[PDB]
Write a protein that binds this ligand. Sequence first.
Ligand SMILES: *SCC1=C(C)C(C)(C)N(O)C1(C)C
Ligand SMILES: [Cl-]
Ligand SMILES: [Cl-]
Ligand SMILES: [Cl-]
Length: 164
Amino acid sequence: MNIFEMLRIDEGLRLKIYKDTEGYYTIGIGHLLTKSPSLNAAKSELDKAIGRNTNGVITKDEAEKLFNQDVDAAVRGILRNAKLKPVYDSLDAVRRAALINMVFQMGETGVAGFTNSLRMLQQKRWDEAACNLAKSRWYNQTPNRAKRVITTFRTGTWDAYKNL
Ligand SMILES: *SCC1=C(C)C(C)(C)N(O)C1(C)C
Ligand SMILES: [Cl-]
Ligand SMILES: [Cl-]
Ligand SMILES: [Cl-]
């Protein structure tokens, strides 16, 4: 297991524009296109992202290209953020992946806002952190995915991703 395999499990792979869990136009391996309700706006975002006039459909290689960029953007976002960088630096490789996962799904700003959870993580109070993380819109809206990420923070193992 690694961050790519983890996120691939959590985000799936779809080669045609589809609506994510929040009803937002997405493609590939959880590549958010726009929050706009306009399919045309989403298609324009796609074309710009890929560098060609798509028919709202991409190849597996193109999906994986955007995925690589998105993982890199999540890491870059953590490292540039004053709240997230110290937490990330304090974590082991497995838990770092769990943090990258959260950033991929909700963005740098969103995760940086989890002040209490971040403190418990930095403190290495794993069970306390896990309970605190569950008290969120994030957990309520995507409970199976959040449960997997939380288990990863609680244990520092890939147990939540092994049967998957
Ligand atoms: S992480 C959720 C938990 C709560 C809120 C109580 C106190 C019921 N627990 O025993 C857990 C730690 C499972
Ligand atoms: Cl998805
Ligand atoms: Cl992009
Ligand atoms: Cl879920």
